[PDB]
C-alpha cells in the first residue's frame, strides 16, 4: 500500500522510540545545527529517525 506508508508503519512499530516523527522534529535539529551552538560539528550525517537506524532484527 505505497512505499511511504510501509516505511512509516514500520518505523512506528520497530524504532526504539515509538512515536510519530513530525517534520518539526527534524526542524529543531536543523535549527540547532544551523546555530552557533554547534560550532564544533561539521561534515557529519546526524540521524533523526527515532533511532530506527540502530536496529538489525525487528521484534516481530
Amino acid at each position: 500500500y505505497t512505499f511511504i506508508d510501509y516505511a512509516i508503519e514500520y518505523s512506528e512499530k520497530y524504532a526504539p522510540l515509538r512515536q510519530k516523527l513530525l517534520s518539526t522534529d527534524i526542524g529543531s535539529v536543523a535549527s540547532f545545527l544551523l546555530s552557533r551552538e554547534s560550532r564544533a560539528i561539521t561534515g557529519q550525517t546526524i540521524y533523526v529517525d527515532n533511532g530506527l537506524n540502530i536496529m538489525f532484527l525487528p521484534d516481530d
Binding site: 505505497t2 512505499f3 511511504i4 506508508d5 516505511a7 512509516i8 518505523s11 524504532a15 516523527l21 513530525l22 517534520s23 518539526t24 522534529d25 527534524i26 526542524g27 529543531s28 535539529v29 536543523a30 535549527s31 545545527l33 544551523l34 546555530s35 552557533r36 554547534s38 560550532r39 560539528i41 561539521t42 561534515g43 557529519q44 550525517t45 546526524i46 540521524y47 533523526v48 529517525d49 527515532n50 530506527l52 537506524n53
Partner: protein, 229 residues
Amino acid sequence: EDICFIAGIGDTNGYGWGIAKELSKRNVKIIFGIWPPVYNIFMKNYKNGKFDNDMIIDKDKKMNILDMLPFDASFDTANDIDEETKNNKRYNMLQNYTIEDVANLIHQKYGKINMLVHSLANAKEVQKDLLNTSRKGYLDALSKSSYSLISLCKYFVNIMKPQSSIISLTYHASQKVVPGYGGGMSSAKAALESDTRVLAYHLGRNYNIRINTISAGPLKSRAATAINK
C-alpha cells in the same frame, strides 16, 4: 540578524516547512526557494490564506517569511537554461531562477546570509529499481539531488558570513538497501553524504563555514507519495 535561505519548499507537508517553522521560533528571517513548476500555485495558495493556520508559531506568533523566490536547482547560471524550458509554460513569466541568479538576487535585496538549507531532491526514474535505471535517469538524480548541493555552496558562499552554516537532508537508503528507493536516489544520497564530508573540509578551511546533513526518518510528504512501490 539571521537570514536563512531554504531551497526546496513546495507546500507545508514537507521537511522544508518543518525547518522554516522551527527557525522562525528563534526569529530568523526566512527566504523560500520554490521550484518554478509549482511557484504560481504556491503563491496562489499563500495569497488565499491556505497556509494561515500552518504559519502560527507555538509561542503565539506569525511565521515571518522575508521573501519567496522561484528557484531551480538544475540550472547553475543563465546560460545553462535550455530553449525547451526557456519557453516552457511555467518558466516564461519568471526570471532569475538559476542558482547564481537567486544568489545575486538575495544579495542585492537583503545583503549577506548565514544559514543555508538544501531540502530538495528529484529523479526521473525513481519508480524503477537501480538495475533498470537508464544512464540519463541516473545522472538526472545525481544532478538534481547531489550536485545541486555543491553548486549551491559554490555560489552562495560568496554572500555568506564567516561561521555561517549549511545543512541538507539525506536518507539511510544510501548505507543500507531499501527496495523501492530506486532511480538512482540511493546513489545520489550516498554521494550527498560523501560530498558533505569533502565540502566540510574545503568550506571549513577556506571560509570557516560548517556543513552537515540530516538523515531523516519517513514523513508522508508530496514527494514521498510519488514513490510508487
